[PDB]
């Protein structure tokens, strides 16, 4: 699609067989999902936002579906208020900013 | 232009003949720039996302030249770690997310 930006660019994603709403976020280096359980080994990481930091669980090589695109990548899980699809996965679905 | 997302989508902006780098951020409702003087009246606003909030000042009718496009709109000023062009101005320059 060509998604306009008058509203938040929210899409449907699927991970671990759970469907979630997530924000297409060119301002995020990484993909950060709200607190949830995921099987697998993980590493702790700290990420930064506009006014603070949150600790996340980094899972690697996770299959995740974004707006119908089956991709594989790193997902961070932690106390974000909104599920965020960041550049690590936006690049896999071929997403560009056009103006 | 069409901007891929392998790197952070940083572009040059001009505001009152001042040269500034800023991040094209589809995950931000609003535009927020690091501390600077801007003309006109303002009101305090809280903004946040990942982690805690920061207090900023809201100025209106501020022209910004973004990657060649002169636009005019609301600009928040405050202790953001990164200059951020949010949807309020992205829409004004005709920006979409395409895949």
């Amino acid at each position: 699609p060509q998604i306009t930006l008058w509203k938040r660019p929210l899409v449907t994603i699927r991970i671990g067989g759970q469907l979630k709403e997530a924000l297409l976020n060119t301002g995020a280096d990484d993909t950060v999902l709200e607190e949830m359980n995921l099987p697998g080994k993980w590493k702790p990481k700290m990420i930064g936002g506009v006014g603070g930091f949150i600790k996340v669980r980094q899972y690697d090589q996770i299959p995740i579906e974004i707006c119908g695109h089956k991709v594989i990548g790193t997902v961070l899980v932690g106390p974000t208020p909104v599920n965020i699809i960041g550049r690590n996965l936006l690049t896999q679905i071929g997403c560009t900013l056009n103006f | 232009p069409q901007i891929t997302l392998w790197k952070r989508p940083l572009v040059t902006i001009r505001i009152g003949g001042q040269l500034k780098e800023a991040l094209l951020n589809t995950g931000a409702d609003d535009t927020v720039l690091e501390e600077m003087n801007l003309p006109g009246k303002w009101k305090p606003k809280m903004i946040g996302g990942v982690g805690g909030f920061i207090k900023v000042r809201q100025y209106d009718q501020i022209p910004i030249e973004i990657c060649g496009h002169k636009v005019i709109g609301t600009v928040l000023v405050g202790p953001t770690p990164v200059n951020i062009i949010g949807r309020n101005l992205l829409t004004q320059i005709g920006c979409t997310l395409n895949f």
Binding site: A28, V32, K45, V50, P81 | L23, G27, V32, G48, G49
Partner: peptide, 10 residues
């Protein structure tokens, strides 16, 4: 109300 989701790797 959270509205700016800048996120950066460290």
């Amino acid at each position: 109300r959270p509205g700016n989701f800048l996120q950066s790797r460290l």
